[PDB]
Design a protein around this motif. Structure first.
Motif, mmCIF file in Angstrom:
data_model
loop_
_atom_site.group_PDB
_atom_site.id
_atom_site.type_symbol
_atom_site.label_atom_id
_atom_site.label_comp_id
_atom_site.label_asym_id
_atom_site.label_seq_id
_atom_site.Cartn_x
_atom_site.Cartn_y
_atom_site.Cartn_z
ATOM 1 N N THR A 77 0.850 -1.235 -0.080
ATOM 2 C CA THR A 77 -0.307 -0.002 0.106
ATOM 3 C C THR A 77 1.003 1.066 -0.640
ATOM 4 O OG1 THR A 77 -0.375 0.414 2.149
ATOM 5 C CG2 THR A 77 -1.945 -1.114 0.870
ATOM 6 N N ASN A 78 0.554 2.157 -0.923
ATOM 7 C CA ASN A 78 1.488 3.053 -0.996
ATOM 8 C C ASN A 78 1.174 4.121 0.135
ATOM 9 O OD1 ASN A 78 2.487 5.678 -1.458
ATOM 10 N ND2 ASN A 78 1.490 5.903 -4.074
ATOM 11 N N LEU A 79 2.282 4.499 1.202
ATOM 12 C CA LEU A 79 2.062 5.491 2.749
ATOM 13 C C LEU A 79 1.894 6.709 2.312
ATOM 14 C CD1 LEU A 79 2.289 2.355 3.788
ATOM 15 C CD2 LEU A 79 4.040 3.168 4.984
ATOM 16 N N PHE A 80 1.917 7.108 0.983
ATOM 17 C CA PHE A 80 2.000 8.937 1.060
ATOM 18 C C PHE A 80 0.099 9.128 0.050
ATOM 19 C CE2 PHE A 80 5.968 10.835 -0.061
ATOM 20 C CZ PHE A 80 6.822 9.563 1.066
ATOM 21 N N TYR A 119 -4.070 17.644 1.821
ATOM 22 C CA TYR A 119 -3.646 18.266 0.330
ATOM 23 C C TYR A 119 -3.076 17.984 -0.566
ATOM 24 C CZ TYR A 119 -1.491 21.445 -2.515
ATOM 25 O OH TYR A 119 -1.028 22.709 -3.491
ATOM 26 N N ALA A 120 -4.214 17.528 -1.305
ATOM 27 C CA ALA A 120 -3.870 16.533 -3.220
ATOM 28 C C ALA A 120 -3.729 15.295 -3.016
ATOM 29 C CB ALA A 120 -2.326 17.886 -4.229
ATOM 30 N N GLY A 121 -4.442 14.387 -1.531
ATOM 31 C CA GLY A 121 -4.462 13.274 -2.213
ATOM 32 C C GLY A 121 -3.107 12.688 -1.072
ATOM 33 N N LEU A 122 -2.485 13.625 -0.300
ATOM 34 C CA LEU A 122 -1.205 13.602 0.214
ATOM 35 C C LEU A 122 -1.692 12.664 2.683
ATOM 36 C CD1 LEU A 122 0.983 15.785 -0.480
ATOM 37 C CD2 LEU A 122 1.380 13.510 -1.306
ATOM 38 N N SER A 123 -1.121 12.193 2.557
ATOM 39 C CA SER A 123 -1.112 11.373 3.987
ATOM 40 C C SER A 123 -0.076 12.368 4.886
ATOM 41 C CB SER A 123 -0.176 10.003 4.152
ATOM 42 O OG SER A 123 1.175 9.631 3.970
ATOM 43 N N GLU A 124 -0.282 11.806 6.169
ATOM 44 C CA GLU A 124 0.377 13.261 7.075
ATOM 45 C C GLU A 124 2.011 12.852 6.965
ATOM 46 O OE1 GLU A 124 -0.011 11.786 11.454
ATOM 47 O OE2 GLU A 124 -1.542 13.481 10.905
ATOM 48 N N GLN A 125 1.913 11.139 6.285
ATOM 49 C CA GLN A 125 3.067 11.162 6.347
ATOM 50 C C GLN A 125 4.078 11.558 5.570
ATOM 51 O OE1 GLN A 125 4.683 6.772 5.171
ATOM 52 N NE2 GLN A 125 4.670 6.699 7.574
ATOM 53 N N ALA A 126 3.340 11.675 4.251
ATOM 54 C CA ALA A 126 4.271 12.297 3.302
ATOM 55 C C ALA A 126 4.733 13.905 3.411
ATOM 56 C CB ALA A 126 3.105 12.310 2.240
ATOM 57 N N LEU A 127 3.658 14.798 3.985
ATOM 58 C CA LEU A 127 4.241 15.711 4.503
ATOM 59 C C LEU A 127 4.617 16.196 5.940
ATOM 60 C CD1 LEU A 127 -0.080 16.670 5.190
ATOM 61 C CD2 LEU A 127 1.856 17.718 2.683
ATOM 62 N N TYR A 128 4.981 15.153 6.388
ATOM 63 C CA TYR A 128 6.586 15.305 7.746
ATOM 64 C C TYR A 128 7.284 14.675 6.810
ATOM 65 C CZ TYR A 128 2.830 15.310 11.549
ATOM 66 O OH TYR A 128 2.051 15.274 12.430
ATOM 67 N N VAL A 133 -0.175 15.444 -9.883
ATOM 68 C CA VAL A 133 -1.964 15.614 -9.483
ATOM 69 C C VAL A 133 -2.296 14.418 -10.610
ATOM 70 C CG1 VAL A 133 -4.121 16.420 -10.034
ATOM 71 C CG2 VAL A 133 -2.149 17.752 -8.855
ATOM 72 N N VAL A 134 -2.319 13.689 -9.899
ATOM 73 C CA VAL A 134 -2.791 11.772 -10.086
ATOM 74 C C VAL A 134 -3.795 11.500 -9.897
ATOM 75 C CG1 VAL A 134 -1.152 10.859 -8.419
ATOM 76 C CG2 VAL A 134 -2.057 9.980 -10.769
ATOM 77 N N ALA A 135 -4.782 10.521 -10.557
ATOM 78 C CA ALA A 135 -5.742 9.833 -9.449
ATOM 79 C C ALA A 135 -5.643 8.921 -9.069
ATOM 80 C CB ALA A 135 -6.610 9.853 -10.958
ATOM 81 N N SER A 136 -5.275 7.549 -9.488
ATOM 82 C CA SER A 136 -5.207 6.353 -8.827
ATOM 83 C C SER A 136 -4.770 6.867 -7.666
ATOM 84 C CB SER A 136 -4.289 5.421 -9.022
ATOM 85 O OG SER A 136 -4.409 4.751 -8.482
ATOM 86 N N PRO A 137 -4.798 6.233 -6.113
ATOM 87 C CA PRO A 137 -3.908 7.364 -4.815
ATOM 88 C C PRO A 137 -2.656 6.282 -4.808
ATOM 89 C CG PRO A 137 -6.289 7.027 -4.935
ATOM 90 C CD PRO A 137 -6.557 5.944 -6.238
ATOM 91 N N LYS A 138 -3.058 4.931 -5.659
ATOM 92 C CA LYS A 138 -1.692 4.226 -5.728
ATOM 93 C C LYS A 138 -0.134 4.779 -6.249
ATOM 94 C CE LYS A 138 -5.064 -0.363 -6.256
ATOM 95 N NZ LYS A 138 -4.927 -1.288 -7.344
ATOM 96 N N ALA A 139 -0.600 5.794 -6.678
ATOM 97 C CA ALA A 139 0.406 6.911 -7.573
ATOM 98 C C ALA A 139 0.582 8.484 -7.053
ATOM 99 C CB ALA A 139 0.401 6.879 -8.946
ATOM 100 N N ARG A 140 0.097 8.769 -6.002
ATOM 101 C CA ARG A 140 0.792 9.228 -5.088
ATOM 102 C C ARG A 140 1.776 9.685 -4.415
ATOM 103 N NH1 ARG A 140 -3.777 11.140 -5.968
ATOM 104 N NH2 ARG A 140 -5.587 9.895 -4.170
ATOM 105 N N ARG A 141 2.435 10.834 -4.685
ATOM 106 C CA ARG A 141 4.059 10.459 -4.857
ATOM 107 C C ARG A 141 4.394 12.095 -4.537
ATOM 108 N NH1 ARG A 141 3.101 9.484 -10.012
ATOM 109 N NH2 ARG A 141 3.915 10.716 -11.193
ATOM 110 N N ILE A 142 5.518 12.634 -4.087
ATOM 111 C CA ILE A 142 6.281 14.316 -4.067
ATOM 112 C C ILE A 142 7.371 14.282 -5.377
ATOM 113 C CG2 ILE A 142 6.232 14.459 -1.866
ATOM 114 C CD1 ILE A 142 8.790 14.436 -1.375
ATOM 115 N N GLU A 143 7.348 15.175 -6.181
ATOM 116 C CA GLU A 143 9.014 15.400 -6.647
ATOM 117 C C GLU A 143 9.275 16.270 -5.701
ATOM 118 O OE1 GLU A 143 8.466 17.996 -10.615
ATOM 119 O OE2 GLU A 143 9.064 15.502 -11.309
#
Lengths: 233, 233
Positions: free
Chosen positions: B44-47, B52-61, B112-122
């Protein structure tokens, strides 16, 4: 009479008759000093009008060159002593002043000023700037066109190989405002221009390098009444 | 590494020569190496999340970590003096330490992507000169330290880049402005890298020494532009 004495005083061999065309370009024709007589001043000399751009057409070619004795000045460049005399272009017979003669037009304008009584003289102090280059090449034909400028001061020559080495002290782009020599390579020339201008009746106020790289320069001269100033230009 | 190898060698075989230098030319684009990242556990994608923008709070940290240790990461992600010729107050310069899904002034874009499976940061500031290994590692460690210490990102920048803004002098976070600065940051801010015994002091100090020697060559050798600017001083 002052003219006839200048002829003897400077042992003048020729008289260079000058005038300006519509575009603003000074033109000239020369006659031996011995062709200058009393008639010359009262009736001028005849010449073909149709030869100058924008002047007389197919039928009315001939016109008059009227020497203006107040303009007499020695040419400082010609090899043989020669006196320059600016002329107005007059309509033959009427001796009026050609509608298309720019000097006549300027005189008419100074007249109209006095006529309206608004004032009796106009004062003009123009500040023409110019460029001094070493090489200028250009052309245009069916297969293309081009223009190439070159000067020892051009910033682009910071990389140029020179026979005796690149001495490289050049005014950068927009960096010509006053670096002392050697960055400014035109001190001696600007002064010769000044001295010569004064030998020709102009009064110089200052001279300096201008802003642009590649030889922009300026000689500032004192104002004068409108028509006399255009002559000065 | 393979990628570079293929690029270098295919180019060579085609009669070309390739370079991954970040800024070979002044006046045109540099070469960057944006890094898209995300974490995962048991597929599972922990991000992905509701923030914001489909992110997990983990991504933000994680983002917060990257931002906190940006200058130190620079020493690995932009390890050349040349790197800083790409990271300069420009419009699209990925130099503002902030995140956004649009503002391409922000060094951290959120795709900005649809599938939450592809959520990430650049993270946009890295360049290809960076050591894969060390650059990626430093990015991770900074992210983890952002998590372990719940370092909040603050709010996303959706306004504008470095120029106008220029309101509050716009001194918000920024990436290192020179290699030395980045090396110094790495020196001081090394704890997050030593975590887990991943990076040792010796390793870090050795790396810094290698780069300082490089930084010196550039700092000590006269630059062509210095002649343009100061030869006539």
């Amino acid at each position: 009479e002052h003219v006839l004495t200048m002829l003897n005083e400077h042992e003048v061999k020729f008289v260079d008759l000058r005038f300006t065309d519509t575009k603003g370009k000074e033109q000239h024709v020369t006659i031996p000093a011995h062709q200058v007589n009393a008639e010359f001043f009262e009736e001028g000399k005849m010449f073909d009008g149709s030869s100058i751009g924008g002047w007389k057409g197919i039928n009315e070619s001939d016109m008059v060159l009227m020497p203006d004795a107040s303009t007499a000045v020695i040419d400082p460049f010609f090899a043989d002593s020669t006196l320059i005399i600016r002329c107005d272009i007059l309509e033959p017979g009427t001796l009026q002043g050609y509608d298309r003669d720019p000097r006549s037009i300027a005189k008419r304008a100074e007249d109209y000023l006095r006529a309206t009584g608004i004032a009796d003289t106009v004062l003009f102090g123009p500040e023409p700037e110019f460029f001094l280059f070493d090489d200028i090449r250009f052309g245009a034909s069916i297969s293309g066109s081009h223009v190439a400028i070159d000067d020892i001061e051009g910033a682009w020559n910071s990389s140029t190989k020179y026979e005796g080495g690149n001495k490289g002290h050049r005014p950068g782009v927009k960096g010509g405002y006053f670096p002392v020599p050697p960055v400014d390579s035109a001190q001696d020339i600007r002064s010769e221009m000044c001295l010569v201008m004064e030998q020709m009746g102009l009064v110089v106020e200052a001279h300096h390098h201008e802003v642009a790289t590649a030889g922009q320069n300026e000689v500032a001269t004192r104002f004068n009444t409108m028509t006399k100033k255009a002559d000065e230009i | 590494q393979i990628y570079k190898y293929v690029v270098h060698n295919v180019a060579h075989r085609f009669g070309k020569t390739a370079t991954f230098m970040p800024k070979p030319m002044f006046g045109d684009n540099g070469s960057g190496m944006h890094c898209h990242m995300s974490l995962a556990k048991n597929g599972t994608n922990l991000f992905s999340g509701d923030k914001y923008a489909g992110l997990s709070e983990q991504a933000l940290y994680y983002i917060g970590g990257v931002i906190k240790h940006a200058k130190a990461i620079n020493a690995l992600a932009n390890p050349t003096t040349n790197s800083y010729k790409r990271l300069v107050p420009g419009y699209e310069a990925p130099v503002m330490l902030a995140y956004s899904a649009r503002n391409r002034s922000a060094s951290i874009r959120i795709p900005v992507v649809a599938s939450p499976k592809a959520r990430r940061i650049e993270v946009r500031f890295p360049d290809p000169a960076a050591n894969p290994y060390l650059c990626f590692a430093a990015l991770l460690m900074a992210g983890l330290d952002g998590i372990k210490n719940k370092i909040h990102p603050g709010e996303p920048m959706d306004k504008n880049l470095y120029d106008l803004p220029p309101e509050e002098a716009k001194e918000i976070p920024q990436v290192a402005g020179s290699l030395e600065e980045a090396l110094n940051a790495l020196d001081l801010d090394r704890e997050f890298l030593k975590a887990g015994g991943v990076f040792t002091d010796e390793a870090i100090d050795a790396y810094i020494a290698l780069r300082r020697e490089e930084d010196d060559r550039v700092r000590m050798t006269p630059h062509p532009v210095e002649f343009e600017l100061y030869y006539s001083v």
